From Swiss-Prot:
Directly cleaved by HTRA2 to produce active form. This is Stromelysin-1. Zn(2+) 1 binds at residues 69, 71, 84, 97. Ca(2+) 2 binds at residues 59, 91, 93, 95. It comes from Homo sapiens (Human).
């Protein structure tokens, strides 16, 4: 696993998230379930807990965007960059932006929102890219078998627990 420079880490266990807008690609409930599942794979293996804010500024602001959308890193249209996220910290840090020039799907016929979201929240909690091919944080994870089979790899668990510790016990 790789952890970011000078170890940007959330200095608290309870983090809030806020879904700012909704893709036309999916029902709103499907966007909601994919982000909840993405958050729960990391919750399961750390003492971190998350809750949802509907207004105000949450730690992890989630939004769908196309091309230039307000930060210095515009999206590129179809394919290639699918989403990006900032490492822990205040303001735009911890936030995750999803490229809506992708076709976000519940399954594998397009770009699977669960899997890209779970990868991206790994960056939001402080994981960088793994050299380990079977890891969710490996750059090419989008070529991995989704919840027909999905499980976090030992490497991702080792990485997130080197930052926040194991589940409370
Ligand atoms: Ca933030
Ligand atoms: Ca793109
Ligand atoms: Ca789209
Ligand atoms: Zn962005
Ligand atoms: Zn990544």
């Amino acid at each position: 696993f790789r952890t970011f420079p000078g170890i940007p880490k959330w200095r608290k266990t309870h983090l809030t998230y806020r879904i700012v807008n909704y893709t036309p690609d999916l029902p709103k409930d499907a966007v909601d379930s994919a982000v909840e599942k993405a958050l729960k794979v990391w919750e399961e293996v750390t003492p971190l807990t998350f809750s949802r804010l509907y207004e105000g500024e949450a730690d992890i602001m989630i939004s769908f965007a196309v091309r230039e959308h307000g930060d210095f890193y515009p999206f590129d249209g179809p394919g290639n960059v699918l989403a990006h996220a900032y490492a822990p910290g205040p303001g735009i840090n911890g936030d995750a932006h999803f490229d809506d020039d992708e076709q976000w799907t519940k399954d594998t016929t397009g770009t699977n929102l669960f899997l890209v979201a779970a990868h991206e929240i790994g960056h939001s909690l402080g994981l960088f890219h793994s050299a380990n091919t079977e890891a969710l944080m490996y750059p090419l994870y989008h070529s991995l078998t989704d919840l027909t089979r999905f499980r976090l790899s030992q490497d991702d668990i080792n990485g997130i627990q080197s930052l926040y510790g194991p589940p409370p016990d």
